[PDB]
Copies of this chain bind each other. A is one copy, B any other.
């Protein structure tokens, strides 16, 4: 604890600064300011703050080994915090816009922002645009005279682009690639020939791992001026693997976790999603199951969903998950040893990250 309530207080000065800049510069009336205060809180708070705290943890590690003034430690911790929020604000940006795209109902127990009676799709879309816009003013204000700014903005811009690309990958995985046409309406795949592990990993990589694990870990280094004390390739590879597992957990939970516990009602089967469950099923199933899959997958009607959820329990997908989990634990622990070669404290910060995903 402690570091979290210190991360939460940094949110408050971000929120204050942004709304002050709006008032004193952007001619905002106290009412619209109020709207944007509630907007922020609803889309940014409520979560575990796990991605943002990751910047704080990596930064916190190096303080133990590195000699800094008291005022220096406080400067680094503060930047890790603004870095933390830059990310959660980038996520809240995507979440808001992803849910409108998907057509979601619940998220963290509460309705999706656009479903708020006095928001509407018309506003939420723009609110999303503002959320990411805010990540930039944070950067330009707080890190105005930091040597890591040009690097950090550049890392941020590319991470963002990666996420947007992966968002396209995700939303187009149910129709056939060769049939993709802006002028022809997109029909659902019948053959499911693009439900491979190679295409699946391609989706997850960009749509999640980059921003959920890469961005936070490297921002931790950036704020701590320790990018020189890691092999960057190594940092890259670990984040793509721990992040892949993160989404694989999501995919399973979706299908097999009560609405109350999940925070939402999962519709990947309805949405014809290219999930871990689907890909792994089709890498296991006999022709008779495959046919009973095609004839029932990607449909809204609960009875068709039952067939799929019934199939998965019989197809024993807890088996391959275990086998996947233990192959991940295998390669994650391998990379941490490799990390200890240049950066022992970063290695154990990555280690802390792994458990914090494995455990949850």
Contact = CB atoms under 8 A, between A and B. Distances in A.
Interface string A118-159: 111111011101100100110010000000001001100110
A164 interface: yes
Contact of A180 (B34, B120, B121, B182): B34
Q: Max chain B CB contacts within 10 Å: which of A35, A121, A126?
A: A126
Contacts of A167: 126, 129
For this chain, the copies found in one complex come to 2
A182 B133 contact: no
A130 to B, nearest CB: 5
Contacts of A129: 97, 164, 167
A126 B172 CA distance: 11
A152 to B, nearest CB: 12
Given A38-B182, A133-B161, A126 B101 contact: yes
Nearest to A135: B157
Nearest to A186: B118
A42 interface: yes
A269 to B, nearest CB: 18
A42 B177 contact: no
A161 to B, nearest CB: 5
A29 interface: yes
Interface residues of A, number: 61
Contacts of A34: 180
A181 B123 CA distance: 12
Contacts of A126: 97, 101, 164, 167-168, 171
Given A118-B181, A180-B32, A130 B100 contact: no
Nearest to A160: B133
A39 B165 CA distance: 14
Residue with the greatest number of chain B CB neighbours at <10 A, chosen from A38, A116, A129, A181: A129
A96 to B, nearest CB: 10
B118 A171 contact: no
Given A125-B97, A165-B26, A183 B133 contact: no
Interface string A14-38: 0000000010001111011011101
A183 B123 contact: no
Contacts of A154: 140
Contact of A184 (B117, B122, B150): B117
Contacts of A140: 154, 157
Given A172-B32, A183-B117, A185-B118, A137 B153 contact: no
B161 A206 contact: no
B117 A100 contact: no
Query: Which among A137, A168, A206 has the highest number of chain B CB atoms within 10 Å?
Result: A168
Contact of A182 (B28, B39, B136, B165): B39
B123 A171 contact: yes
Interface in A60-117: 97, 100-103, 116-117
15 contacts: A27-B202, A31-B178, A31-B180, A35-B182, A97-B126, A118-B180, A118-B181, A119-B182, A122-B171, A130-B164, A130-B168, A133-B157, A133-B161, A137-B158, A150-B150
B137 A157 contact: yes
A184 B120 CA distance: 11
